[PDB]
Design a protein around this ligand. Structure first.
Ligand SMILES: [Hg+2]
Ligand SMILES: [Hg+2]
Lengths: 306, 306
């Protein structure tokens, strides 16, 4: 039946994207009810980049210093405030398309859909995982700031990311919808760089279970392993240590496939030590770590091929 | 800035998905204006699968034999007709959310976004390419028939695919929005199977240009090649033969990077003959062929890193 990195339908989020302008800078904003959210760096000018004092820069602005455009309509700003690294703009109109929603701060290793947007206009949607080093390997060009990340559950949109900048290695950093950065990054031009990253062990295991659910088990073996012995191998291949909590999480998938978690860990250990010998898993030649146990249960059939 | 397999925002299509029921079978339908489109096999029963005569099966149906549900609203069918492998249901209501649109039959190697849907409710969106063998490697489960594929250009949705079935190897087959199947497949239970497939050479080349545009050129070399000599190597690695037409298409990308097309072909030849030696391109360990020259120009910056 296949397995793809699929994102959530973006319709509910497309109806919330607007354009925010201050000075000569234009970027994206998120319009929910009568509030518009956007990166606070929309108020920076060329000489503010290296060491900006957003408090000082903001006090010098009025409500009309901000221009908010929704489609072909102009929204009047009737108030503004700064919440951490975000700007909260109050507008005279409540978004008619505001969906049921909430703000969530996702944890490292978890996934979400990103709606790439430019000038308040959505251009594409794709899935990505919050890396353990707190960055995401997205696809963003100039003008993409303000684009948001989200998950959708029973018609409720859980926003978890707003794009702010690109680091030296081409990876991206941002904040949650409360303006707090994911990772030790700050919104100013410095020498900051992404820290060392690691493979999301729990997700690789989830993915191996998806492969079995879809009918493939060539990588399994007759061995088992203890968490300790497994982590000795994981540490050598730069994989996150596996904990009992992660083992517990894999419970449902283990049950659906009849493959004990530690037995699957034994399979992973072998794959790491001997490689895949020209073979593929779910079409991949490498071990995928951008699918959480949740993502697998969501996309795969509830009935294993067997 | 990154490179991801990104799909088009699905909002405009989500507003067109409905549920169609006939007998005990329920699947997805596409609602545009006052017409609902869905796979004609929605009228098949267990004993019709092997050798169904849709003409005979359909004449036995009335307008009320069909149930169309849009969200929490029931649409009354006031007419029905069969167009090739599709059923065209006339309804008493015109879809208020019908976007500007058109029906297009895409060509092999081209890409489109798929909005996976179940019971008339969108569940996910992802990109895929129409393989040279006329199938797509999608992700579909029971109840996904009727899900559509599309591309979006300047607010105009070009529908190009409707899902009908899964073949033995787990790949998928469908029709364009005129009900004509892509490939030599038919909507009946038979021993039909996907034919031999090949790698989309033009797309791999497009992808290599994207890598250079993003700042990477470790795979380039000092050689060049003629189309003939290139195709001798391509034929050995099961790649589609490159034609002058394909060379012409790569013109813009060649110009933006300053790398002659045949020179890039020389690079590809080397990569095929010597492998990637543990190196990666745009994060991949293999040669990607699901990105068209159009997809690259769309996602990549217009300014090469250099
Ligand atoms: Hg700034
Ligand atoms: Hg049928």
């Amino acid at each position: 039946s296949g397995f793809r990195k699929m994102a959530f339908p973006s319709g509910k989020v497309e109806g919330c994207m607007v354009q925010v302008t201050c000075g000569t800078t234009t970027l994206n904003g998120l319009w929910l009810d009568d509030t518009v959210y956007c990166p606070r760096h929309v108020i920076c000018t060329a000489e503010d980049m290296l060491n900006p004092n957003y408090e000082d820069l903001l006090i010098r602005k009025s409500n009309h210093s901000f221009l908010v455009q929704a489609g072909n309509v102009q929204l009047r700003v009737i108030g503004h405030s700064m919440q951490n690294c975000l700007l909260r703009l109050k507008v005279d109109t409540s978004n008619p398309k505001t969906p049921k929603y909430k703000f969530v701060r996702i944890q490292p290793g978890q996934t979400f859909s990103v709606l790439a947007c430019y000038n308040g206009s959505p251009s594409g949607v794709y899935q990505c995982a919050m890396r353990p080093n707190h960055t995401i390997k997205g696809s963003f060009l100039n003008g993409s700031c303000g684009s948001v990340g989200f998950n959708i559950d029973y018609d409720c949109v859980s926003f978890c990311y707003m794009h702010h900048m690109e680091l030296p290695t081409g990876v991206h950093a941002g904040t949650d919808l409360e303006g707090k950065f994911y990772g030790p990054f700050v919104d100013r031009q410095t020498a900051q760089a992404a820290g060392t990253d690691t493979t999301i062990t729990l997700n690789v295991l989830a993915w191996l279970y998806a492969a079995v659910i879809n009918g493939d088990r060539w990588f399994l073996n007759r061995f088992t392993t203890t968490l300790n012995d497994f982590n000795l191998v994981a540490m050598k291949y730069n994989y996150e240590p596996l904990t009992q909590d992660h083992v517990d999480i894999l419970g449902p998938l283990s049950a659906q496939t009849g493959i004990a978690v530690l037995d699957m860990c034994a399979a992973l250990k072998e794959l790491l030590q001997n490689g895949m010998n020209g073979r593929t898993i779910l079409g991949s030649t490498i071990l995928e770590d951008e699918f959480t146990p949740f993502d697998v249960v969501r996309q795969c059939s509830g009935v294993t091929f067997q």
